[PDB]
C-alpha cells in the first residue's frame, strides 16, 4: 500500500493519498533564514507522562515504524486546546548512512527522530476523527544523535526483539515518557504542517525541540537492524530502514522559535 | 502538465509520469557516507565547446527553464561512448531565497545549477530516442554560488528579456561553453540517476563538478525575475522561480568521486 522504497515510495503517496501532494507538507529543513523568535511561545507542560508501572502499553511493528500506544490521560498543557497522547514512534536511516531524522537543521539530518503524537481531545473524540480536522493533531519531535547510552530509550529498545516482523506486538510496562525528551524543552521550533506519513493531512501543530537527545552507537544500530517491514512468513523480507520522508519545500513561510 | 509549486508540483509528477516514482531518481545530496573514490574516473575532455561568436544558437523559454540548443559537433570525450551536446539549461530559486540548486552538498543548496545535456550519439540518432534507453544521456552539472559577476554566464543572461514567456525564442551568439565550467574539472562526482524533470527517465550518467562557479547577486536577481512559466497572453501568469526538484532517496546507490 505505501513504502519508503521503490514503486510505492514517497513520490507515489499522492496517488492514493492526495494530501501528500497538497499544502503545508512536513517535514522541512529548519534553517536560520526562516526562523522567527516568538515571545508568545511559552513552555509546554507534560501531564500524565509518568505512566503507571502497573499498566502495560502495546508496542507494535506496523510495517512502517515501531509504535508504542499511549493513554489519553497523558497530555500536553500549554496550547489553546488540550492535546491528548495517542502513540509515539520513530524514524531512522541505516547502518551505511545513519542519518534518518525527518526534520533537518541547517541541512543536517540527525541520526533518528522520535514523534509523540497527540490529538485535540477538547474538540474530537479520538485521534482518527481529529486527524483530518482543523487543529486536529500536535506532535512533539525529538532529534536523536549518537552519544552516551540512554537507559530511558532502552525501556523501548529492549523490546524490539519481540516486534521484529509486521503485525507482531509486545507489552511495555509504563515508564516516565518525559525521560525521552531532551534538555531545555522550553527551547523549540513551532510551525503548522502535516503528517509526514500517509495520509499526509495538513492538520499537525509541530513542536521540534531545539536540543537533541543521545543514544549509544549500539542503541542506534539495534534500532536500524532489529525490524522488518514484512510479515514473518513473507518470502521476500524487507529490512525496516530509511523510514523517513524527504524534506518538503517551505516557501514564503516562517518557523517560530521559543529561543532568540 | 507539471510545475514546481502546488497541485501539479513534484509530489504529484508520478500521477502522470510513472518514472518520477521509480528508482534511481535525481537530484541527490552529496554527503560523505555515500561517496566512494574511484581511481578509474579519468578527466573528461570538452570538444567543440568553443562555439563560433559569428554563429548563433537558439535560446528558448520552454515553460520550465531557459534552454540553449547546442550543436551535436559539441561532445564529451572520455566516457565509454561518445556523448554529443543537445542543450543546456538552469535551475534556480527566487529573489528572497536564492538557494535553488538541485544537487546539494552536505545538505546545503547552492544558488543555482547549470545542466549541459548530452546523448549517446554512438547508439542513438537524437536525444529524445536516447532519453528512454540504457546509457542514453550524460549530464554535466555545475553548482553556482552567489559571488563575482560572471561575464560568460552573462552571454546567456543578457538575452533573458527576449524569452520572458513560454514558447519565446531568441538567438545567442556562440561563446566558449567551457567558460561556464569550474576550476579543476578533473574533480567530479559521478553517479547513475535520472532526468530531474518529468518524465524522470532513469537513463542519466551524472557528472557533478566538485567546484562551484560564481555569478553575482544582480545576475541571480535577473535570472529570478525575468522569466514566466506561462505564455505572454496567459491571464494567470506564473513566475519561473524555484524550478528545482527536492533531493531523492539513494535506493542503495553510491556516488563515485574522481578525487580522494
Ligand atoms: C495506513 O497507514 C497510515 O495511514 C499511518 C501509518 C503510520 N503513521 C503514523 O503512525 C503517524 C505518523 C505521524 S507523524 N510521523 O507525522 O508524527 C502522525 Cl502525526 C500520525 C500518525 S498515525 C495517525 C494517522 C491518521 C489516523 C490517526 C492516527
Ligand atoms: C515533460 O518533458 C519535458 O517537456 C522536459 C522539459 C524540461 N526538461 C528538460 O529539458 C530536461 C532536463 C534534464 S535534467 N534537468 O535532468 O538535466 C534532462 Cl537530462 C533532459 C531534459 S529534456 C530531454 C528531452 C528529450 C531529449 C533531450 C533530453
Ligand atoms: Zn513520525
Ligand atoms: Zn536540469
* Three-state DSSP string of chain B: CCCCCCCCCHHHHHHCCHHHHCCCCCCCEECHHHEEECCCCCCCEEECCECCCCCEEEEEECCCCEEEECCCCCEEECCCCCEEEEEEEEEECECCECCCCCCEECCEECCEEEEEEEEECCCCCCHHHHCCCCCCEEEEEEEEEECCCCHHHHHHHCCHHHCCCCCCEEEEECCEHHHHCCCCCCCEEEEEECCCCCCCCCCEEEEEECCCEEECHHHHHHHHHHCECCCCCCCCCCECCCCCCCCCCCCCCCEEECCC
DSSP letter assigned to residue A106:
T
Identify the bridge partners of residue B141 per DSSP, sorted by sequence position.
B115, B208
Task: Name the closest-CA residue to atom 15, ligand 1.
Answer: A196
- Beta-carbon contacts of residue B79 (< 8 Å; ≥ 6 apart): B44, B138, B205
Spatial CA neighbour of A47 closest among A87, A5, A84: A84
CA distance A161 to B19: 37
Closest ligand to residue B128's CA: 2
In Å, how far are A191, B24, B205 from A185, measured between CA atoms? 16, 39, 46
Task: Name the closest-CA residue to atom 1, ligand 2.
Answer: B198
CA dihedral B83, B87, B214, B34 (to 10 degrees): -50
- Cβ B3 under 6 angstroms from ligand 2: no
- Cβ A139 under 6 angstroms from ligand 1: yes
For an interface test with A, the pick among B110, B199, B249, B253 (most A C-beta atoms closer than 10 Å) comes out as: B249
Contact A9 B249 (CB under 8 A): yes
Q: In this structure, is the dihedral angle defined by the CA atoms of residues B93, A192, A45 and A54, taken in order, positive or negative?
A: negative
Helix (H) or strand (E) holding A127: helix A127-130
Contact criterion met (CB below 8 Å) for A103 and A84: no
Backbone dihedral angles phi then psi of residue B97, each to the nearest 5 degrees: -155, 75
Of A4, A21, A108, the CB nearest to B12: A21
Residues of B with a Cβ under 8 Å from any A Cβ are 4-5, 7, 9-15, 20-23, 25, 31, 33-34, 94, 96-97, 104, 106-109, 242, 246-251
Contact criterion met (CB below 8 Å) for A82 and A93: no
| Residue B205, domain CATH | 3.10.200.10
Closest ligand to residue B70's CA: 2
Contact criterion met (CB below 8 Å) for A4 and B249: yes
Q: How far is the CA of B244 from the centre of ligand 4 (A)?
A: 8
Count other Cβ atoms within 10 Å, centred on residue B114: 24
User: B96 to chain A: nearest residue by CA?
Assistant: A252
In chain A the first and final C-alpha atoms are separated, in Å, by: 43
DSSP letter assigned to residue A249:
P
**Exposure pattern of B66-84 as b/e (b: 16+ CB <10 Å)?**
bbbebeeebbbebbebbbb
State how many domains chain A has: 1
Mark the residues whose beta carbon lies below 5 A from ion ligand 4.
B 115
Q: How far is the CA of A114 from the centre of ligand 3 (A)?
A: 7
Atom of ligand 2 nearest to the CA of B127: 26
Identify the bridge partners of residue B142 per DSSP, sorted by sequence position.
B114
CA distance B91 to B113: 5
CA distance B83 to B138: 7
In Å, how far are A2, A30, A222, A245 from A10, measured between CA atoms? 8, 21, 25, 7
Contact criterion met (CB below 8 Å) for B214 and B183: no
Identify the bridge partners of residue A109 per DSSP, sorted by sequence position.
A104
Question: What number of residues does chain B have?
Answer: 260
- Cβ A118 under 6 angstroms from ligand 1: no
Backbone dihedral angles phi then psi of residue B82, each to the nearest 5 degrees: -70, 130
Tell me if residue A208 falls in helix, strand or coil.
Answer: strand
∠ CA A117-A119-A121, rounded to 5°: 145
Helix (H) or strand (E) holding A222: helix A217-225
Measured between CA atoms, how close is B75 to chain A, in angstroms?
34
Q: What cell numbers appear for B175 in the block?
A: 561563446
∠ CA A173-A177-A180, rounded to 5°: 120
CA distance B135 to B133: 6
For an interface test with A, the pick among B1, B16, B18, B21 (most A C-beta atoms closer than 10 Å) comes out as: B21
Place of cell 561512448: B81
Tell me if residue A22 falls in helix, strand or coil.
Answer: coil
Backbone dihedral angles phi then psi of residue B146, each to the nearest 5 degrees: -70, 120
Ligand 2 pocket mutation pick from B20, B101, B195 by most atoms within 8 angstroms of CB? B195
In chain B the first and final C-alpha atoms are separated, in Å, by: 42
CA distance B1 to B222: 26
Q: How far is the CA of B65 from the centre of ligand 2 (A)?
A: 10
Of A21, A96, A109, the CB nearest to B11: A21
CA distance B71 to B174: 11
Q: Is the peptide bond before B27 cis (omega within 30 degrees of 0)?
A: yes
- Cβ B103 under 6 angstroms from ligand 2: no
Spatial CA neighbour of A245 closest among A2, A4, A1: A4
Active site residues of B: 64
Place of cell 568521486: B257
Chain breaks in chain A (C to N over 2.5 A) after: none
Q: What cell numbers appear for A41 in the block?
A: 511561545
Q: What would the DSSP string read from start to end of A34-72? A: GEEE-TT-PPPEEES-B--TTSEEEEEE-SSSEEEE--T
- Cβ A197 under 6 angstroms from ligand 1: yes
Contact criterion met (CB below 8 Å) for A113 and A141: yes
Helix (H) or strand (E) holding A77: strand A75-77
Structure-determination technique: X-ray
Please pick, among A64, A75, A109, A118, the residue that the annotation labels catalytic.
A64
User: B251 to chain A: nearest residue by CA?
Assistant: A5
CA distance B59 to B171: 6
CA distance B78 to A192: 50
Residues contributing to the annotated binding site of B:
89, 91, 115, 196-197
Place of cell 567530479: B188
Identify the bridge partners of residue B239 per DSSP, sorted by sequence position.
B228
**Pairing relationship of beta strands B45-47 and B66-69 according to DSSP bridges:** unpaired
> Residue A133 belongs to what domain range?
1-260
Task: Name the closest-CA residue to atom 24, ligand 2.
Answer: B128
Task: Name the closest-CA residue to atom 2, ligand 2.
Answer: B198
Query: Resolution limit in angstroms?
Result: 1.5
Contact criterion met (CB below 8 Å) for A213 and A185: no
- Cβ A131 under 6 angstroms from ligand 1: yes
CA dihedral B66, B93, B27, B33 (to 10 degrees): 150
Amino acid at each position: 500500500k505505501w513504502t519508503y522504497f521503490g514503486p510505492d515510495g514517497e513520490n507515489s503517496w499522492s496517488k492514493k493519498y492526495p494530501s501528500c501532494g497538497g499544502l503545508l507538507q512536513s517535514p522541512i529543513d529548519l534553517h536560520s533564514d526562516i526562523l522567527q523568535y516568538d515571545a508568545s511561545l511559552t513552555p509546554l507542560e507534560f501531564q500524565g507522562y509518568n505512566l503507571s508501572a502497573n499498566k502495560q502499553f502495546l508496542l507494535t511493528n506496523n510495517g512502517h515504524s515501531v509504535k508504542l500506544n499511549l493513554p489519553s490521560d497523558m497530555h500536553i498543557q500549554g496550547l489553546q486546546s488540550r492535546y491528548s497522547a495517542t502513540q509515539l514512534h520513530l524514524h531512522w536511516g541505516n547502518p551505511n548512512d545513519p542519518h534518518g531524522s525527518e526534520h533537518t537543521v541547517s541541512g543536517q539530518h540527525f541520526a533518528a527522530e522520535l514523534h509523540i503524537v497527540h490529538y485535540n481531545s477538547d474538540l474530537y473524540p479520538d485521534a482518527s476523527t481529529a486527524s483530518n480536522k482543523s487543529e486536529g493533531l500536535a506532535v512533539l519531535a525529538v532529534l536523536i544523535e549518537m552519544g552516551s547510552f540512554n537507559p530511558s530509550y532502552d525501556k523501548i529498545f529492549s523490546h524490539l526483539q519481540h516486534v521484529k516482523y509486521k503485525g507482531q506486538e509486545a507489552f511495555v510496562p509504563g515508564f516516565n515518557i518525559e525521560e525521552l525528551l531532551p534538555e531545555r524543552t522550553a527551547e523549540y521550533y513551532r510551525y503548522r504542517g502535516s503528517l509526514t506519513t500517509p495520509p499526509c493531512n495538513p492538520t499537525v501543530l509541530w513542536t521540534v525541540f531545539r536540543n537533541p537527545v543521545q543514544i549509544s552507537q549500539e542503541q542506534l544500530l539495534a534500532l536500524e537492524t532489529a525490524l522488518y517491514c514484512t510479515h514473518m512468513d513473507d518470502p521476500s523480507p524487507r529490512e525496516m530502514i530509511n523510514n523517513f520522508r524527504q524534506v518538503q519545500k517551505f516557501d514564503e513561510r516562517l518557523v517560530y522559535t521559543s529561543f532568540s
